[PDB]
């Protein structure tokens, strides 16, 4: 493994994919205050059991489609 993250599902409208939101966790480079900053990943998932608002664990890979370079590992917390 090279990169592995946790984030929250925001779109489940796909049969072999999901859209996951992740945080930057960053100091603003001139105003010095900390910010969350939400960035999106389109993630591979062939099981199709994780859903919107659930918390997921994801891993970085070689490209599987255009704009699709990550794949699902686990469902961490279930939001019902």
């Amino acid at each position: 493994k090279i990169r592995t993250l946790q984030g929250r599902v925001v779109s489940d409208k796909m049969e072999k994919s999901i859209v996951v939101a992740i945080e930057r966790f960053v100091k603003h480079p001139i105003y010095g205050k900390f910010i969350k900053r939400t960035t999106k990943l389109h993630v591979h998932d062939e099981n199709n059991e994780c859903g919107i608002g659930d918390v997921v664990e994801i891993r970085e890979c070689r490209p599987l489609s255009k704009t699709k370079s990550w794949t699902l590992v686990r469902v961490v917390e279930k939001a019902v």
């Binding site: 603003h28 105003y31 010095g32 205050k33 910010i35």
Partner: protein, 123 residues
């Protein structure tokens, strides 16, 4: 202004206004010249002074100052203009060049004789 505002979107300088945008930020600019006439300054500085109406190479016309004694400038003569600040004579931010193109220099300069493109004393 707050950091929570500047982190969401930065704010912009307002505005430092430009003096002579008709010169295209060049050190000199050319123009064709129409009419040459006398104009009067603000009365505390009372005198007569001379100007010309100069359409440039670009879309703009300016009222340009003529320094130095001698009237022989003509229409469609094609002359050079420089930005030069005049604050007691109406609408003038611009000076004519005597030392270049279809302009004449000034006679009998006793002091500061390199002005107006005037050469070494021989006359």
């Amino acid at each position: 202004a707050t950091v929570n505002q500047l982190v969401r979107k930065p704010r912009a300088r307002k505005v430092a206004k430009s003096n002579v945008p008709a010169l295209e930020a060049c050190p000199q600019k050319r123009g064709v010249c129409t009419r040459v006439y006398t104009t009067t300054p603000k009365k505390p500085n009372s005198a007569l002074r001379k100007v010309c109406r100069v359409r440039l190479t670009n879309g703009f016309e300016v009222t340009s100052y003529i320094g130095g004694e001698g009237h022989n400038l003509q229409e469609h003569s094609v002359i050079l203009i420089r930005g030069g600040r005049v604050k007691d004579l109406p609408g003038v931010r611009y000076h004519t060049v005597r030392g270049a193109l279809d302009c004449s220099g000034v006679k009998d300069r006793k002091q500061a004789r390199s002005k107006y493109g005037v050469k070494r004393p021989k006359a």
